[PDB]
Design a protein around this ligand. Structure first.
Ligand SMILES: COCCN1CCC(C(=O)N=O)(S(=O)(=O)c2ccc(Oc3ccc(OC(F)(F)F)cc3)cc2)CC1
Ligand SMILES: [Ca+2]
Ligand SMILES: [Ca+2]
Ligand SMILES: [Zn+2]
Ligand SMILES: [Zn+2]
Length: 164
């Protein structure tokens, strides 16, 4: 009948996410705003759009957990692993998990939830790690400097190579 795409990518442009639970470290508003901004990084340079769902099954299910949390990628307590996300697909596909033994912030302290979420949602949409140290998809955390976060070129090229 019909073929799979040549990459792990969503075939639909409208995607849904659900924030399953919340970190102690930030208010519900702070987390929601961080995630909204993180999805905006990718929607601003592609045809993709994101709607939040408050319950049920979203494409991208977002949760905070520690140690064993229901997959083969258990967390390791404070430091080390910060988060992980699954490539586009059914079920766990697209889901994003955040280690709640980390200190999450809206600031320069601890780990900035926005930057990590933006990175992880790259994964949720089909980007793997970049080798370019300036890239958002570089697998090392750094906190930014300029106030208006600008998605690096490598990440722009990468996401566009999947969705236009
Ligand atoms: C044991 O070694 C760990 C091996 N792994 C690679 C790192 C890691 C991962 O990439 N998972 O997706 S991770 O340390 O939890 C991690 C997660 C998000 C990040 O998000 C970023 C990325 C770049 C940033 O920098 C920039 F903003 F300047 F671009 C900021 C946050 C940075 C690091 C887990 C798996
Ligand atoms: Ca950890
Ligand atoms: Ca999913
Ligand atoms: Zn997990
Ligand atoms: Zn990563």
């Amino acid at each position: 009948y019909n073929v799979f795409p040549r990459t792990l990518k969503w075939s639909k442009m409208n995607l849904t996410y659900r924030i399953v639970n919340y970190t102690p470290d930030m208010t519900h508003s702070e987390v929601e705003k961080a995630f909204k901004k993180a999805f905006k990084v990718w929607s601003d340079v592609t045809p993709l759009n994101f709607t939040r769902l408050h319950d049920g099954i979203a494409d991208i299910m977002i949760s905070f957990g520690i140690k064993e949390h229901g997959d083969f990628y258990p967390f390791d307590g404070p430091s080390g692993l910060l988060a992980h996300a699954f490539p586009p697909g059914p079920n766990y596909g697209g889901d994003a998990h955040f280690d709640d033994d980390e200190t999450w912030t809206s600031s320069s302290k601890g780990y900035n939830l926005f930057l990590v979420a933006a990175h992880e949602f790259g994964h949720s949409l089909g980007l793997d790690h970049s080798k370019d140290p300036g890239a958002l998809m570089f697998p090392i955390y750094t906190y930014t400097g300029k106030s208006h976060f600008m998605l690096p070129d490598d990440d722009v090229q990468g996401i566009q190579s999947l969705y236009g």
